[PDB]
Amino acid sequence: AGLSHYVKLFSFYAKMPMERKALEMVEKCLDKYFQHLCDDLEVFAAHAGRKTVKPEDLELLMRRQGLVTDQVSLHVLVERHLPLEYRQLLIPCAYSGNS
Amino acid sequence: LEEKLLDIRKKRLQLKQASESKLLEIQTEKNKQKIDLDSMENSERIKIIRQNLQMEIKITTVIQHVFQNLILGSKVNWAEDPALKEIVLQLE
Amino acid sequence: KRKAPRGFLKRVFKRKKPQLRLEKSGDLLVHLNCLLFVHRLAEESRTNACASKCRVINKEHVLAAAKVILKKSRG
């Protein structure tokens, strides 16, 4: 499903041939990534006091990976990777009705 | 059939040499326009206005392309407006 | 490939944790989380494959890649 789409992304993100048994290991690597993202998100939101998780709870976890910085803000990374309609909903544009 | 073919070939050769003469006249007339171009290469006041055209259309090809991207992104209601209608559909 | 899945990401979030309320576009942001995760994994796998000088990515490179990427990408 989502992991299968993600290894399809791995094909064009590694840009170099892979093996099927290796992508089945990338399956468990993605599951192992999420087994940390879901309980890191829970604690980052719990300190925030919200049982829900909001976007700013996730830019902080981004800072925890460190790939978001003072030079590369949260709104920068959405620009480089997500498509146009997939980026419209996160960063506020301006129509006097900023999202 | 061979007589008609010979007649057609003679007509075609006449209209080929005639066309080469006409096209050579047109090309030497283009060469005559080339000294009119040399009448531009004097560059006492053609050069300055040509450079102004190049340095002002490059501003008119920027503000134009920030209208194809500003009558697009915002809450534009682009063509449902008589005003922007003549300013959208911007001439190149 | 220009894709991003709405549904499977939310299903994975619900399966791993039954108590969360991922917001209207928070699915989008966790998908960006994994986008940058897989980007880091791809680039550092290129790096450690160059360390082993192997022209094709293999199990041993990505196994070492896991213990680094999923450890720094951890909060």
Add this chain to the structure above:
Amino acid sequence: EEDALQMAVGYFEKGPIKASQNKDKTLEKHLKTVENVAWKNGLASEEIDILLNIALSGKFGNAVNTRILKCMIPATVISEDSVVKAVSWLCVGKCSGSTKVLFYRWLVAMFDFIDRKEQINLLYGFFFASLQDDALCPYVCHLLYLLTKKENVKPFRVRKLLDLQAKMGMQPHLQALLSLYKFFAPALISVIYFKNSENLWKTALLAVKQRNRGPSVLNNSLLLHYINCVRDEPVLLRFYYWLSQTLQEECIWYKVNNYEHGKEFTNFLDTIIRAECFLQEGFYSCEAFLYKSLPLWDGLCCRSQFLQLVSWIPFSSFSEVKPLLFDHLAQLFFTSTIYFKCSVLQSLKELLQNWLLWLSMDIHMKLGGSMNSVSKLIHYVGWLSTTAMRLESNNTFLLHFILDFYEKVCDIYINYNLPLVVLFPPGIFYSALLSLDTSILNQLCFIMHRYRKNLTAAKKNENFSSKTYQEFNHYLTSMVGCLHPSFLSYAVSFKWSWYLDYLFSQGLQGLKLFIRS
């Protein structure tokens, strides 16, 4: 009703669906049944384009249910795409991504029907900036492929497409857009194709088309005319150089396969010959290649193609072209069968016609040293064709082609205006007169009649005067006194006038023409 029904739908659009007393679908389904008969008039298509997608009911099923069959009856007009450019406006309503995909699919599929494609082409950037969307990219790329012009290839668009290629994956739609932008001003270099998912809509588009019906230069004929009209240097020197390097590389290609390469080189020589026949002068790279490749040439290797390039040769002096070419089309002529002797006497028959065409214009365009060259060509072929009947024992199939050559030698003065009436060698005229089949006898008789006509015409406007007339009277007294086993056979098949009429009705046209003298 179709207009009234969509105003009724608009009435549903001014109010909530719950507050409405009737279904929003059923009326649109009646409209769909109408579309099954007649989809949308230009004003009707305009209206159903502009309102049903902006903000109102326009359900992502109901809007698509129309958009599948919303195509135009006559065509799409400017006002259709105007207010729906405010549907690509892509905001609080946005005509959401599934109907947006369907919208760009419709814009690709019905792009064949716009009154002014120039207006939409001036809307290039509006669709180009929508290409950033991943869902719209595979269809916006096709739309821009059909929308593109040179004024829309600004370098910022080129770098935006390159940024899209780098950010996204290698895609056939982006590849098609990039190759097209390289076809235009080359700010980028790159080396599927009108592949649409509109095939399901194409059946509907097929019905729409039926309803509309009911209501470097060789392979370019349109540009070959330009080079036909310029005997310039930078055009016939680039052509000389490509043609020579293609008649060399593809001829060296013979020396490795010689079997399947003899069908592309042969089909390339055929295009060469066709281009020369159209342009009517022998390419300067085709005699330069013939002079190089004639000594090496055998009899049958591209025989019909090499002996059609010989026909298209620039008119040169015989003392400078015979040793180079005619000394190898005689070394091969005398050593090959009748099917190469006839294929050279046919080759040189067309060569004579081509040398006479360009000499008639040398009279039209204001001689004696070029005169002696066609005369020498005729005398040399008459030397080829008088010993060819010696090698082949006066073969009638070969004599037919020999007199086919002189079929174009008698009719020089009347036809090409050149004072070059040149008679037979005795060994050809007398062996055609003493032939055994009527089909070459009457050909010789027709050629004699044409010689009569041309000599009489040359007596009018004025060596061609003394020795030619002496030898022609020699031939005349020999034939008119003899005018015979072929005629014996014709008589066996059967009052001198009755016999002549029987001969004349049996296709004896040349004999009748010469007897009428």
Add this chain to the structure above:
Amino acid sequence: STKESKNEKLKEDLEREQRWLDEQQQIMESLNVLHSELKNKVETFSESRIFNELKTKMLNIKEYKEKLLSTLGEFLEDHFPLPSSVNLITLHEMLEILINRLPYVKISDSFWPPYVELLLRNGIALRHPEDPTRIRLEAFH
């Protein structure tokens, strides 16, 4: 069998030569009328008159620019600044001035981030590929 082939290639070549003669007559009349037209149509061009046409282009392009910029003043009131953070018009024109003579900075991260991410999505401006705290107006030239 060979005079029937000669007659076949004679009829086919007759049709082909008739087509070629038709296309030759067409480009004969077209070339003659083009020579007649271009005679004393573009040849009657003075250098002074040529520069006057460039001055007419100067005024036409300047009025087109003052049309586009007048609309940039009018329509962008639909945009309007609300509540420094700089007005969208002013920060956009400070983008334009910077790219006008060049820069890759152009705003040095002008404020009101909805406004900078307004003119970034549509292709108006671009981020710097290395240090994304600095902006460039897409180099529309």
